[PDB]
Amino acid sequence: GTVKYTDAQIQRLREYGNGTYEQKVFEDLASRDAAFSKEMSVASTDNEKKIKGMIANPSRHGLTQLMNDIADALVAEGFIEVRTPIFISKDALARMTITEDKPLFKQVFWIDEKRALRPMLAPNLYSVMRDLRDHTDGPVKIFEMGSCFRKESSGMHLEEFTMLALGDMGPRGDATEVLKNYISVVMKAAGLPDYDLVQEESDVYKETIDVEINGQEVCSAAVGPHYLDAAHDVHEPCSGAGFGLERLLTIREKYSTVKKGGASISYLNGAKIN
Amino acid sequence: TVKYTDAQIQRLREYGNGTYEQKVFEDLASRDAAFSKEMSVASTDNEKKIKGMIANPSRHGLTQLMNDIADALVAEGFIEVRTPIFISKDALARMTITEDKPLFKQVFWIDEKRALRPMLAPNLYSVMRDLRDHTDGPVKIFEMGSCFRKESMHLEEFTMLALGDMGPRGDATEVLKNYISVVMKAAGLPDYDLVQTIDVEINGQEVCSAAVGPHYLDAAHDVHEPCSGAGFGLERLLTIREKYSTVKKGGASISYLNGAKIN
Ligand SMILES: Nc1ncnc2c1ncn2[C@@H]1O[C@H](COP(=O)(O)OP(=O)(O)NP(=O)(O)O)[C@@H](O)[C@H]1O
Ligand SMILES: Nc1ncnc2c1ncn2[C@@H]1O[C@H](COP(=O)(O)OP(=O)(O)NP(=O)(O)O)[C@@H](O)[C@H]1O
Ligand SMILES: [NH3+][C@@H](Cc1ccc2[nH]c3ccccc3c(=O)c2c1)C(=O)O
Ligand SMILES: [Mg+2]
Ligand SMILES: [Mg+2]
Ligand SMILES: [Mg+2]
Ligand SMILES: [Mg+2]
Ligand SMILES: [Mg+2]
């Protein structure tokens, strides 16, 4: 038939269940509602089994594990892991071209008149990369994993999310080829070797190369552009990429929403505890 | 006798991780000679350390400390959790952090109803209680993450380790002291003092506060679960272990990287 679960039913099923409910079709409302009742019980049973398993076998958190898996792969390739402050300045945002008129500006959480929660890692990474160039003539390769914040409103969007951002200044070889190779290192280390690279428009970067899995963006990457590099006193080929770690984990683990695999007081590693 | 001047101490600590406050000199000329030499050594040592990190990169020192402690706690039966940085005003109020408490004035507000967490306890206690709804046995969990406080060994953003144990125990104080030992040994700081609630100090500097039975976290229930917990400042632990001359060098920064100044 053509009858689907209602939007409310889909939300109720996804609360405790990680099935693919949006695909189901039914002949009529009675059959839809009977199937909903059955699948709500399955979802709750499966959820409880997962919680009992985590209690019986304590483990590192799934998001922490993914971070460690990727970070170890990048260190093995000669990337320095950095940690930078969550607070950044209004000026730092302006140097990314994120000023009052831009849409991303409206998504920023301000702490005071001059400081904000970072919505991206690039401002701090540009700073650190430029300073590291003072200490070497070779490539400068760094990465950070940490929380970024944006006002949002819900598909694959969190207000606090974990970005992995990498930067490579002065790469040996063509900057685009080098960028594609480091994307490959990350994706394989994350357990997601199958993905598409797709050119997309960008307010900040003009054009990005995005990593998409079945049409879902999990990363944006860019070489420069020159104006952005020069705004950070960078005067050589440069590239970087930013990955959404909860998005990666959600896709790999087949969680039905993006809210289950990261930080939460309701979910733990895909299962709802309350 | 003369010591390094206050300005000389600050200048030496900018690039250097020596212990400069103890040095004594016979006269200004010898102080100034020693200062010039120690400044030069600190700067060259710093440059070499940065060149070594570029040449042979490693996991960040703070990330490594988190992993070392986390490994040890999971081996002891603790579940790792991650909770949001944002918490509600009501959650703080249930913490007893109300408009009158001095910590309240240290809170970074995001809007009228939400703040950056100044500690991990409110979220950790909530998660422990919910996990206890799913088992008959005790629940032991930990989190490591950023907390935020307006401040004057203090950082505005710092990394807390918080661990908790809820449910049937038996000699809760000795069990809590053992969890402290597990963390401190895994961090590479086996020598410390317990002080009085229990505080952990190294040479007089607080690095952890711990408690049995903080039933104030649970005003919503008449009957409480037994519980204990402990909170550690990870930058403080790393600074002490690595002998960095300030607390600003081992954690998150755009001027320091693993103890060394990059600008
Ligand atoms: N609110 C969010 N929640 C979770 N992940 C996010 C969020 N915003 C961005 N990301 C991730 O961070 C990566 C780099 O950020 P960025 O390129 O600025 O995202 P974006 O273009 O705003 N993505 P989108 O909002 O889906 O169109 C993205 O590719 C996502 O994987
Ligand atoms: N601003 C800060 N910067 C770094 N570490 C901190 C900070 N505040 C607290 N900590 C650490 O977090 C642990 C638990 O927090 P808490 O018990 O609230 O600290 P506290 O009593 O305010 N300590 P203090 O401010 O040194 O007197 C402390 O023992 C410290 O190791
Ligand atoms: N568009 C997303 C993802 C993205 C794209 C290109 C980037 N290029 C860089 C170059 C140098 C240093 C850091 C970066 C950086 O993080 C970066 C991040 C965002 O920024 O949120
Ligand atoms: Mg967006
Ligand atoms: Mg996009
Ligand atoms: Mg994008
Ligand atoms: Mg204090
Ligand atoms: Mg204290």
PDB file of all heavy atoms in Angstrom, chain A residues 120 150 152 156-159 161 163 216-220 242-244 246-247 258, ligand 1:
ATOM      1  N   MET A 120      33.469  26.154  15.067  1.00  0.00           N
ATOM      2  CA  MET A 120      34.358  25.399  14.186  1.00  0.00           C
ATOM      3  C   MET A 120      35.739  25.467  14.823  1.00  0.00           C
ATOM      4  O   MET A 120      36.008  26.330  15.664  1.00  0.00           O
ATOM      5  CB  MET A 120      34.384  26.005  12.776  1.00  0.00           C
ATOM      6  CG  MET A 120      34.650  27.571  12.750  1.00  0.00           C
ATOM      7  SD  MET A 120      34.878  28.138  11.108  1.00  0.00           S
ATOM      8  CE  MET A 120      33.296  27.842  10.374  1.00  0.00           C
ATOM      9  N   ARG A 150      26.741  25.295  17.925  1.00  0.00           N
ATOM     10  CA  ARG A 150      25.953  26.105  16.998  1.00  0.00           C
ATOM     11  C   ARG A 150      24.482  26.048  17.398  1.00  0.00           C
ATOM     12  O   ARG A 150      23.980  24.988  17.780  1.00  0.00           O
ATOM     13  CB  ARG A 150      26.057  25.543  15.571  1.00  0.00           C
ATOM     14  CG  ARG A 150      27.423  25.685  14.935  1.00  0.00           C
ATOM     15  CD  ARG A 150      27.493  25.145  13.520  1.00  0.00           C
ATOM     16  NE  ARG A 150      28.896  25.038  13.115  1.00  0.00           N
ATOM     17  CZ  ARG A 150      29.316  24.738  11.894  1.00  0.00           C
ATOM     18  NH1 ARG A 150      28.469  24.563  10.895  1.00  0.00           N
ATOM     19  NH2 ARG A 150      30.620  24.581  11.682  1.00  0.00           N
ATOM     20  N   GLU A 152      20.860  25.542  16.420  1.00  0.00           N
ATOM     21  CA  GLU A 152      20.318  24.802  15.280  1.00  0.00           C
ATOM     22  C   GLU A 152      18.821  24.562  15.459  1.00  0.00           C
ATOM     23  O   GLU A 152      18.297  24.575  16.575  1.00  0.00           O
ATOM     24  CB  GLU A 152      21.002  23.428  15.054  1.00  0.00           C
ATOM     25  CG  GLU A 152      22.545  23.433  14.944  1.00  0.00           C
ATOM     26  CD  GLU A 152      23.047  23.639  13.510  1.00  0.00           C
ATOM     27  OE1 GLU A 152      22.214  23.861  12.600  1.00  0.00           O
ATOM     28  OE2 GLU A 152      24.288  23.631  13.299  1.00  0.00           O
ATOM     29  N   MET A 156      20.344  15.375  11.757  1.00  0.00           N
ATOM     30  CA  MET A 156      21.787  15.258  11.868  1.00  0.00           C
ATOM     31  C   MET A 156      22.430  16.500  12.445  1.00  0.00           C
ATOM     32  O   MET A 156      23.636  16.719  12.276  1.00  0.00           O
ATOM     33  CB  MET A 156      22.434  14.881  10.527  1.00  0.00           C
ATOM     34  CG  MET A 156      22.177  13.435  10.126  1.00  0.00           C
ATOM     35  SD  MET A 156      23.615  12.370  10.328  1.00  0.00           S
ATOM     36  CE  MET A 156      22.912  10.764  10.002  1.00  0.00           C
ATOM     37  N   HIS A 157      21.666  17.326  13.175  1.00  0.00           N
ATOM     38  CA  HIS A 157      22.200  18.512  13.850  1.00  0.00           C
ATOM     39  C   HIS A 157      22.075  18.404  15.366  1.00  0.00           C
ATOM     40  O   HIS A 157      20.985  18.122  15.894  1.00  0.00           O
ATOM     41  CB  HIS A 157      21.468  19.776  13.387  1.00  0.00           C
ATOM     42  CG  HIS A 157      21.892  20.239  12.033  1.00  0.00           C
ATOM     43  ND1 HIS A 157      21.021  20.306  10.969  1.00  0.00           N
ATOM     44  CD2 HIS A 157      23.091  20.662  11.568  1.00  0.00           C
ATOM     45  CE1 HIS A 157      21.669  20.740   9.899  1.00  0.00           C
ATOM     46  NE2 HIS A 157      22.926  20.964  10.238  1.00  0.00           N
ATOM     47  N   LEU A 158      23.183  18.679  16.034  1.00  0.00           N
ATOM     48  CA  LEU A 158      23.309  18.807  17.475  1.00  0.00           C
ATOM     49  C   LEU A 158      23.745  20.237  17.784  1.00  0.00           C
ATOM     50  O   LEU A 158      24.428  20.872  16.975  1.00  0.00           O
ATOM     51  CB  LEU A 158      24.402  17.846  17.935  1.00  0.00           C
ATOM     52  CG  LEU A 158      24.200  16.365  17.647  1.00  0.00           C
ATOM     53  CD1 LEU A 158      25.508  15.613  17.830  1.00  0.00           C
ATOM     54  CD2 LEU A 158      23.145  15.823  18.574  1.00  0.00           C
ATOM     55  N   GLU A 159      23.365  20.762  18.951  1.00  0.00           N
ATOM     56  CA  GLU A 159      23.898  22.092  19.278  1.00  0.00           C
ATOM     57  C   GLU A 159      25.331  22.025  19.794  1.00  0.00           C
ATOM     58  O   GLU A 159      26.093  22.976  19.606  1.00  0.00           O
ATOM     59  CB  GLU A 159      23.012  22.896  20.221  1.00  0.00           C
ATOM     60  CG  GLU A 159      22.983  22.495  21.601  1.00  0.00           C
ATOM     61  CD  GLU A 159      21.873  23.208  22.385  1.00  0.00           C
ATOM     62  OE1 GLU A 159      21.220  24.184  21.892  1.00  0.00           O
ATOM     63  OE2 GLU A 159      21.650  22.754  23.516  1.00  0.00           O
ATOM     64  N   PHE A 161      28.523  19.481  19.151  1.00  0.00           N
ATOM     65  CA  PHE A 161      28.963  18.344  18.349  1.00  0.00           C
ATOM     66  C   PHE A 161      30.481  18.267  18.398  1.00  0.00           C
ATOM     67  O   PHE A 161      31.169  19.229  18.788  1.00  0.00           O
ATOM     68  CB  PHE A 161      28.491  18.365  16.873  1.00  0.00           C
ATOM     69  CG  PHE A 161      28.977  19.531  16.080  1.00  0.00           C
ATOM     70  CD1 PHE A 161      30.048  19.393  15.221  1.00  0.00           C
ATOM     71  CD2 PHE A 161      28.388  20.779  16.214  1.00  0.00           C
ATOM     72  CE1 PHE A 161      30.518  20.481  14.469  1.00  0.00           C
ATOM     73  CE2 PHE A 161      28.864  21.880  15.485  1.00  0.00           C
ATOM     74  CZ  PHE A 161      29.930  21.723  14.614  1.00  0.00           C
ATOM     75  N   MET A 163      33.841  17.931  16.445  1.00  0.00           N
ATOM     76  CA  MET A 163      34.540  18.023  15.177  1.00  0.00           C
ATOM     77  C   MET A 163      35.921  17.389  15.304  1.00  0.00           C
ATOM     78  O   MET A 163      36.605  17.553  16.319  1.00  0.00           O
ATOM     79  CB  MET A 163      34.691  19.489  14.744  1.00  0.00           C
ATOM     80  CG  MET A 163      35.204  19.676  13.316  1.00  0.00           C
ATOM     81  SD  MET A 163      35.200  21.384  12.683  1.00  0.00           S
ATOM     82  CE  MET A 163      33.480  21.805  12.857  1.00  0.00           C
ATOM     83  N   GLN A 216      24.489  11.834   2.712  1.00  0.00           N
ATOM     84  CA  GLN A 216      24.616  12.548   3.976  1.00  0.00           C
ATOM     85  C   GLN A 216      26.038  13.074   4.119  1.00  0.00           C
ATOM     86  O   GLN A 216      27.006  12.293   4.083  1.00  0.00           O
ATOM     87  CB  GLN A 216      24.320  11.617   5.150  1.00  0.00           C
ATOM     88  CG  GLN A 216      24.438  12.262   6.542  1.00  0.00           C
ATOM     89  CD  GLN A 216      23.602  13.524   6.688  1.00  0.00           C
ATOM     90  OE1 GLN A 216      22.391  13.478   6.538  1.00  0.00           O
ATOM     91  NE2 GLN A 216      24.243  14.643   7.012  1.00  0.00           N
ATOM     92  N   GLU A 217      26.159  14.387   4.297  1.00  0.00           N
ATOM     93  CA  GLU A 217      27.453  15.020   4.533  1.00  0.00           C
ATOM     94  C   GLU A 217      28.005  14.611   5.889  1.00  0.00           C
ATOM     95  O   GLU A 217      27.339  14.783   6.923  1.00  0.00           O
ATOM     96  CB  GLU A 217      27.276  16.541   4.531  1.00  0.00           C
ATOM     97  CG  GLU A 217      28.560  17.348   4.750  1.00  0.00           C
ATOM     98  CD  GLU A 217      28.308  18.845   5.001  1.00  0.00           C
ATOM     99  OE1 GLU A 217      27.280  19.393   4.501  1.00  0.00           O
ATOM    100  OE2 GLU A 217      29.140  19.465   5.716  1.00  0.00           O
ATOM    101  N   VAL A 218      29.250  14.141   5.896  1.00  0.00           N
ATOM    102  CA  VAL A 218      29.976  13.871   7.134  1.00  0.00           C
ATOM    103  C   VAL A 218      31.250  14.694   7.274  1.00  0.00           C
ATOM    104  O   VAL A 218      31.849  14.700   8.360  1.00  0.00           O
ATOM    105  CB  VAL A 218      30.276  12.370   7.325  1.00  0.00           C
ATOM    106  CG1 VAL A 218      29.000  11.553   7.311  1.00  0.00           C
ATOM    107  CG2 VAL A 218      31.210  11.871   6.259  1.00  0.00           C
ATOM    108  N   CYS A 219      31.670  15.417   6.240  1.00  0.00           N
ATOM    109  CA  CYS A 219      32.884  16.212   6.278  1.00  0.00           C
ATOM    110  C   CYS A 219      32.829  17.243   5.167  1.00  0.00           C
ATOM    111  O   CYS A 219      32.258  16.998   4.095  1.00  0.00           O
ATOM    112  CB  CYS A 219      34.107  15.318   6.071  1.00  0.00           C
ATOM    113  SG  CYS A 219      35.693  16.142   5.698  1.00  0.00           S
ATOM    114  N   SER A 220      33.423  18.406   5.438  1.00  0.00           N
ATOM    115  CA  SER A 220      33.751  19.384   4.408  1.00  0.00           C
ATOM    116  C   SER A 220      35.242  19.665   4.447  1.00  0.00           C
ATOM    117  O   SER A 220      35.816  19.839   5.523  1.00  0.00           O
ATOM    118  CB  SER A 220      33.052  20.718   4.630  1.00  0.00           C
ATOM    119  OG  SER A 220      31.720  20.641   4.221  1.00  0.00           O
ATOM    120  N   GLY A 242      37.092  19.175   8.043  1.00  0.00           N
ATOM    121  CA  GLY A 242      36.381  19.031   9.301  1.00  0.00           C
ATOM    122  C   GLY A 242      35.314  17.956   9.196  1.00  0.00           C
ATOM    123  O   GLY A 242      34.457  17.999   8.298  1.00  0.00           O
ATOM    124  N   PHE A 243      35.399  16.970  10.086  1.00  0.00           N
ATOM    125  CA  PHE A 243      34.516  15.826  10.123  1.00  0.00           C
ATOM    126  C   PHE A 243      33.610  15.905  11.347  1.00  0.00           C
ATOM    127  O   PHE A 243      34.061  16.258  12.446  1.00  0.00           O
ATOM    128  CB  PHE A 243      35.302  14.506  10.271  1.00  0.00           C
ATOM    129  CG  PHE A 243      36.221  14.170   9.130  1.00  0.00           C
ATOM    130  CD1 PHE A 243      37.463  14.781   9.010  1.00  0.00           C
ATOM    131  CD2 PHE A 243      35.878  13.185   8.218  1.00  0.00           C
ATOM    132  CE1 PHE A 243      38.330  14.430   7.980  1.00  0.00           C
ATOM    133  CE2 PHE A 243      36.730  12.826   7.183  1.00  0.00           C
ATOM    134  CZ  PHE A 243      37.963  13.445   7.057  1.00  0.00           C
ATOM    135  N   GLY A 244      32.350  15.524  11.165  1.00  0.00           N
ATOM    136  CA  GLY A 244      31.424  15.430  12.284  1.00  0.00           C
ATOM    137  C   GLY A 244      31.455  14.035  12.882  1.00  0.00           C
ATOM    138  O   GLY A 244      30.943  13.083  12.284  1.00  0.00           O
ATOM    139  N   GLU A 246      30.017  12.544  15.559  1.00  0.00           N
ATOM    140  CA  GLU A 246      28.738  11.892  15.854  1.00  0.00           C
ATOM    141  C   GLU A 246      28.059  11.408  14.568  1.00  0.00           C
ATOM    142  O   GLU A 246      27.424  10.341  14.549  1.00  0.00           O
ATOM    143  CB  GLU A 246      27.788  12.833  16.610  1.00  0.00           C
ATOM    144  CG  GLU A 246      28.197  13.153  18.038  1.00  0.00           C
ATOM    145  CD  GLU A 246      29.153  14.317  18.129  1.00  0.00           C
ATOM    146  OE1 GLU A 246      29.507  14.922  17.084  1.00  0.00           O
ATOM    147  OE2 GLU A 246      29.610  14.600  19.267  1.00  0.00           O
ATOM    148  N   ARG A 247      28.145  12.202  13.492  1.00  0.00           N
ATOM    149  CA  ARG A 247      27.574  11.782  12.212  1.00  0.00           C
ATOM    150  C   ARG A 247      28.234  10.496  11.716  1.00  0.00           C
ATOM    151  O   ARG A 247      27.536   9.547  11.316  1.00  0.00           O
ATOM    152  CB  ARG A 247      27.752  12.913  11.202  1.00  0.00           C
ATOM    153  CG  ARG A 247      26.756  14.017  11.403  1.00  0.00           C
ATOM    154  CD  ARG A 247      26.583  14.897  10.172  1.00  0.00           C
ATOM    155  NE  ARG A 247      25.847  16.121  10.475  1.00  0.00           N
ATOM    156  CZ  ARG A 247      25.664  17.105   9.613  1.00  0.00           C
ATOM    157  NH1 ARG A 247      26.224  17.082   8.411  1.00  0.00           N
ATOM    158  NH2 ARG A 247      24.888  18.135   9.953  1.00  0.00           N
ATOM    159  N   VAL A 258      20.953  11.107  15.282  1.00  0.00           N
ATOM    160  CA  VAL A 258      22.307  11.572  15.600  1.00  0.00           C
ATOM    161  C   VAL A 258      22.527  11.847  17.078  1.00  0.00           C
ATOM    162  O   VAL A 258      23.654  12.163  17.467  1.00  0.00           O
ATOM    163  CB  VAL A 258      22.584  12.815  14.732  1.00  0.00           C
ATOM    164  CG1 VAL A 258      21.874  14.030  15.277  1.00  0.00           C
ATOM    165  CG2 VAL A 258      24.051  13.085  14.617  1.00  0.00           C
TER     166      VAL A 258
HETATM  167  N1  LIG C   1      25.162  21.011  14.247  1.00  0.00           N
HETATM  168  C1  LIG C   1      25.957  20.001  13.877  1.00  0.00           C
HETATM  169  N2  LIG C   1      25.785  18.795  14.464  1.00  0.00           N
HETATM  170  C2  LIG C   1      26.600  17.786  14.127  1.00  0.00           C
HETATM  171  N3  LIG C   1      27.592  17.773  13.235  1.00  0.00           N
HETATM  172  C3  LIG C   1      27.729  18.976  12.659  1.00  0.00           C
HETATM  173  C4  LIG C   1      26.972  20.114  12.909  1.00  0.00           C
HETATM  174  N4  LIG C   1      27.404  21.174  12.127  1.00  0.00           N
HETATM  175  C5  LIG C   1      28.396  20.664  11.432  1.00  0.00           C
HETATM  176  N5  LIG C   1      28.647  19.343  11.707  1.00  0.00           N
HETATM  177  C6  LIG C   1      29.684  18.497  11.125  1.00  0.00           C
HETATM  178  O1  LIG C   1      30.865  19.267  10.986  1.00  0.00           O
HETATM  179  C7  LIG C   1      31.367  19.146   9.638  1.00  0.00           C
HETATM  180  C8  LIG C   1      32.119  20.398   9.274  1.00  0.00           C
HETATM  181  O2  LIG C   1      31.245  21.550   9.491  1.00  0.00           O
HETATM  182  P1  LIG C   1      30.642  22.503   8.370  1.00  0.00           P
HETATM  183  O3  LIG C   1      31.230  22.170   7.062  1.00  0.00           O
HETATM  184  O4  LIG C   1      30.620  23.983   8.812  1.00  0.00           O
HETATM  185  O5  LIG C   1      29.107  21.990   8.357  1.00  0.00           O
HETATM  186  P2  LIG C   1      27.843  22.458   7.559  1.00  0.00           P
HETATM  187  O6  LIG C   1      28.228  22.894   6.170  1.00  0.00           O
HETATM  188  O7  LIG C   1      27.079  23.550   8.348  1.00  0.00           O
HETATM  189  N6  LIG C   1      26.950  21.028   7.516  1.00  0.00           N
HETATM  190  P3  LIG C   1      25.255  21.035   7.429  1.00  0.00           P
HETATM  191  O8  LIG C   1      24.669  21.925   8.595  1.00  0.00           O
HETATM  192  O9  LIG C   1      24.811  19.604   7.546  1.00  0.00           O
HETATM  193  O10 LIG C   1      24.858  21.656   6.032  1.00  0.00           O
HETATM  194  C9  LIG C   1      30.136  18.832   8.803  1.00  0.00           C
HETATM  195  O11 LIG C   1      30.497  18.185   7.593  1.00  0.00           O
HETATM  196  C10 LIG C   1      29.325  17.943   9.746  1.00  0.00           C
HETATM  197  O12 LIG C   1      29.727  16.586   9.637  1.00  0.00           O
END
